[PDB]
Amino acid sequence: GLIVDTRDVEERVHVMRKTKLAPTVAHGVFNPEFGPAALSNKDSRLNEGVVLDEVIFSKHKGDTKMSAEDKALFRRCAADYASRLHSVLGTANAPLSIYEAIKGVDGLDAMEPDTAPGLPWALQGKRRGALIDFENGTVGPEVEAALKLMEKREYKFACQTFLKDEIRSMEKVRAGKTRIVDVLPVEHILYTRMMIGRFCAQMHSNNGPQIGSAVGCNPDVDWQRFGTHFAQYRNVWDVDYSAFDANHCSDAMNIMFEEVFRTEFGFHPNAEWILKTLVNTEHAYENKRITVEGGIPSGCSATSIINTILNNIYVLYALRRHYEGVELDTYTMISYGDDIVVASDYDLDFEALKPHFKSLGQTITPADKSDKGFVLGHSITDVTFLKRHFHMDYGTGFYKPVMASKTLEAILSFARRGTIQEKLISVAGLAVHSGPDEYRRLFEPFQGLFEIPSYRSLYLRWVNAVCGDAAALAHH
RNA sequence: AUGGGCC
RNA sequence: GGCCC
């Protein structure tokens, strides 16, 4: 978005310097072009004269203003997508109780009891369990007073900026391109879940191309469902965004909230309000307070779903701005936040759509190589979704999510102290789709030191998971 | 060091 | 706890 004000204040909000990710035995074997992100300005791996604080906020390059004609069209697309969305999900979108917003429901996982509480609770040295009882699903006086302010629509807040401790490419580590996490206060997350938690639960349960959303999917079993759907189409596009979250313009965000979360769709009047507080935000980083107009904070309850919804409307927006008679059945798509797969039988020109996306402040590029443009004829077996390829399994004839060996090597090369064993079993579930040989090679540095699941046992687990009958068929 | 999903 | 976003 657009940084409108940068003010220095005496109260310093500390960020986590020093990585918690340490090199494993695999690191010296695979030697990955990957490492922990830079969290300190004094990190020796950084390029000379590169200030980490400057790069972190470089993504805020402005807040695109839309004309009345573009806003009217966006409203049409948002309303059209909202129509489709609420037709599938239903309109039982009444507020969640405090209990259900903490403990979750079918399709909605419980609130994390031990994560960061946000501001100003972090300045008071308070943990999440001091404000909210996560066992019995009740709140303290601090949160209850804040919920009352949210009812009255008078609630104000700041976002706590944390540097994301994660593995990134050595190029990005050297460029100081550390991603940031905008931690929202716990009561905001609770109230958002109260306002739109039913809806979010319904979206997770009804994931697929019909609503254009993969939020809630299990790639192990859903790759077959998605793969067979997208293979039915003549053209498939792997569309990349840059700073997707940051580049949501206030116009687009506001209109989407207005069209999707209407009271006629069964929402409480405050659902629209609480989401609109994400448009213009105040961010606290160290001694600095930064006001930003536009963009979506990462730490909101429904960041992925909001991002997914917008992504759907953007594609419908872009196409209708260029072509005539474009409807929801003109194409098919699945998204998960900024990650997107688009398909159609019409020879659509995505290179021509570039400026139309730019009118929303979004920059689209092909994921497929550098290429120097979007091309036609690509199938689902060419594209990447959720860092996973679409490969056919030799033994079953089902689509399976295959990750790049280079990526798996990177993931395996680092871990937090004493979590290597638990991480190994978790990553094994991802590595099983690379085949027996690559599976053996990936875990070769770990042999005799940890327990590595056999390829056979995870393959049979997957077969049953993707389709129960296919596992029984290999017995008949 | 987070939201959300899945394991 | 890990992964994806």
**Domains of chain A: which residue ranges?**
1-207+249-302, 208-248+303-403, 404-476
Q: Per this entry, what is the length of chain A? A: 476
d(CA A95, CA A113): 21
A161 annotated binding-site participant: no
Helix (H) / strand (E) element for A29: namely helix A27-30
Reported structure resolution in angstroms: 2.5
- Is A446 strand, coil or helix? helix
Nucleotide nearest to A423 (CA to C1'): C2
Q: Which residues pair with A391 in a beta bridge?
A: A400
As a rounded value in angstroms, the CA-to-C1' distance for A416 and C2 is 10
Query: Is residue A339 annotated as involved in ligand binding?
Result: yes
Give ∠ CA A193-A198-A201 in degrees, rounded to 5. Answer: 95
Q: Is A91 helix (H, G, I), strand (E, B) or coil?
A: coil
Give A385's DSSP letter: E
A88 token code pair:
């599938």
Q: Which residues, in sequence order, are CB contacts of A344 under 8 Å at separation 6+? A: A233, A234, A235, A330, A331, A332
User: Could you give the CA distance from residue A364 to residue A458 in angstroms, rounded to a whole number?
Assistant: 37
State the DSSP H helix or E strand holding residue A290, giving kind and residue range, or none if neither: strand A280-293
**What number does CATH give the domain A208-248+303-403?**
3.30.70.270
Protein-contacted bases of chain C (C-beta within 7 A): 1-5
Q: Is there a contact between A67 and A306 (Cβ–Cβ < 8 Å)? A: no
For chain A, the farthest-separated pair of C-alpha atoms sits apart, in whole angstroms, at 73
3-state secondary structure (DSSP) of residue A176: coil
Q: How far apart are CA A191 and CA A96, in angstroms?
A: 9
Q: In whole angstroms, what is the distance from residue A57 CA to residue A458 CA?
A: 42
Q: Which amino acid is at A336?
A: Y
Instruction: Tell me phi and psi for residue A250, to 5 degrees.
Output: -55, -35
A179 annotated as ligand-binding: yes
Do A233 and A344 form a contact (C-beta atoms < 8 A)?
yes
Fold of A404-476: Mitochondrial Import Receptor Subunit Tom20; Chain A (1.20.960)
Q: How far is the CA of A164 from the C1' of B2 (A)?
A: 9
Structure token pair of residue A154:
């008078």
Q: Could you check: is the Cβ of residue A45 within 7 Å of any atom of nucleic acid strand C?
A: no
| Statement: the CB of A277 is under 7 Å from strand C | no
Strand C near-CB residues (< 7 Å), A 329-348:
336-339
CB A339 within 8 A of CB A385: yes
The nucleotides of chain B lying under 7 Å from a protein CB are 1-7
Give, for A240, the enclosing helix (H) or strand (E). strand A235-241
The CA distances from residue A406 to A31, A228, A388, A402, A440, in Å, are 10, 27, 12, 12, 15
Whether the CB of A115 is less than 7 Å away from nucleic strand C comes out as no
Q: In what order do the strands lie in the sheet with A384-385?
A: A384-385, A388-392, A399-402
- Distance (Å, rounded) from C-alpha A281 to C-alpha A275? 12
First to last CA, chain A: 59
Cα–Cα distances (Å) from A268 to A106, A190, A196, A262, in that order, read 20, 15, 9, 8
